[PDB]
């Protein structure tokens, strides 16, 4: 009667769920666990050309309303994720996204040049992270529309495949417009993942009178409950403004209902970060059944039936 | 014993609490209620030169985690708030801030010209709102650094008094820096209120499969629980970067503990929006009591003892 199936980017997904990049997808064991999970897909930790230890700990804190982190791109390096995609990932189980977060345009160019062949041969799909908010002294690329255009230009020039972009949240229609205008100039950008963390929040523990993460004086990306309306806004903003592109929702998904909201806003895939961090990949079984339960209660049979159909007043 | 006293801009405030601009401060009755309340101060609704009906309703929605609104600056017009400040407000009770949100730099300039005499004579303090995120086709001025510098230059030229600026949240250190650099060019900007709403979130009611406010396709400013870490981040970011200025915290204050966090982040005054909307002016008795209780438990006697003293790791 019902189906969470998603068909996009020449792939079939059992369901729209996947991990948010950076959550439970850094190590082989994590990637395998994500592959073995009920998720429709997975995306590997945002990689840099070489392994990165990331920021000093503590760099993640679970919170009643979500999470704050300043991980700082700890990752095994591009070769590692490329090898996973090329040699290890069971594409028979589900499609794979590889998140890339070069620290400069040059780094993204170099990795993309090498990713090209593996994408061709294996079908791994690039999610280009333009919104890492946690590397000290590195602005979120997509908050600088010139840096964003330049990065997309460079990747589009060297990378002979469609890819997606992991976007920071924007908070003004002027920015939705400006970002969408730029994204629409790149036909290879076939999906937009909205959103990365709400950047550089500051959690203060009233008990300790201190921040809760070490890097950057305690400023870190916010995820979880905090970010859901912002995520939905961005999902919908780009869903509307980039009609030639898919939107992947990310932000504040804890339940099938939250996922339902993402899809209603226009999400094709739904990424799960904080909730997954706290619950582990078993969450995908829960989220699939919950989303199905929501759809059953609402008498929806497929995601196509309500994707992007949020009613305005 | 303990004091919530705040001293700034030649004024004594019984406590740091005040309404957030736009909340319960549009009408004479509201302004009188705010004045009669236990709040340390109050700010009048952001005004435009002439009255504004504001955006179509529904334009405010209380939420489990806060609020979303697209009020669209409904206000009685500058003359009205000017007259309140000039003729009606009992300054014997508490200092008064007047929030100004002209839709253009010229509108602000013209209002400031006329506000100048009332500020001189009565001591009303301008809070210049550069962060209205709800007027369709009008971007948040403070997201345009050139426009903000321009506006502050234009206002400073005609306004021979100290004033503050109501800021939107920023989400990247590069923007904290850029914004702080601009604000630091203006010695008359003696306070910075961080933050206005997290702009243009989108609340979707899963049950109705619809947005919850009418203007701008449901996109509206987020307040309340959603915004606290962002508010704290901005308060602290500007606290650090504008040591010559005071910071007024605004965002996510429901309790004395929240207020304590604002102050720890660097807030001198603490503004209360969503919580005040949802509880009314009696909230200030609660908040003062709670903040004193927090301070008592933490063995602080004055706000100066911990203002801005959030410990980093
Ligand atoms: C610990 C942690 C690591 C993350 N790493 C990445 C990353 O490497 N690349 C990326 O694009 N986003 C990363 N994110 C952001 C998530 O992908 C996601 O956008 C964000 O957490 C919002 O979703 P959520 O509310 O479900 O947490 C990370 C988030 C967390 C909490
Ligand atoms: C109904 C409503 C009206 C508001 N009107 C104004 C306004 O006129 N000027 C302004 O600077 N901020 C206005 N705000 C934003 C608040 O001043 C405050 O920045 C925001 O709500 C965050 O505080 P909170 O979390 O306590 O709600 C308004 C907020 C709400 C909810
Ligand atoms: O590794 C991190 O700090 C997170 C990056 C991101 O949110 O893109
Ligand atoms: O009147 C409003 O819509 C809100 C204004 C603000 O947040 O500055
Ligand atoms: Ni911004």
Automatic annotation (TrEMBL), chains A, B:
It catalyses: (S)-dihydroorotate + fumarate = orotate + succinate. FMN binds at residues 21, 45-46, 129, 166, 195-196, 224, 250, 252, 273-274. InterPro entries: Aldolase_TIM (IPR013785), DHO_dehydrogenase (IPR050074), DHOD_1A (IPR033886), Dihydroorotate_DH_1_2 (IPR012135), Dihydroorotate_DH_cat (IPR005720). Its main location: cytoplasm. Orotate binds at residues 45, 69, 71-73, 129, 134, 196-197. GO terms for molecular function: dihydroorotate dehydrogenase (fumarate) activity; dihydroorotate dehydrogenase activity; nucleotide binding. The keyword Oxidoreductase applies. Homodimer. Belongs to the dihydroorotate dehydrogenase family. Type 1 subfamily. This is Dihydroorotate dehydrogenase (fumarate). The lineage of its organism: Eukaryota, Discoba, Euglenozoa, Kinetoplastea, Metakinetoplastina.
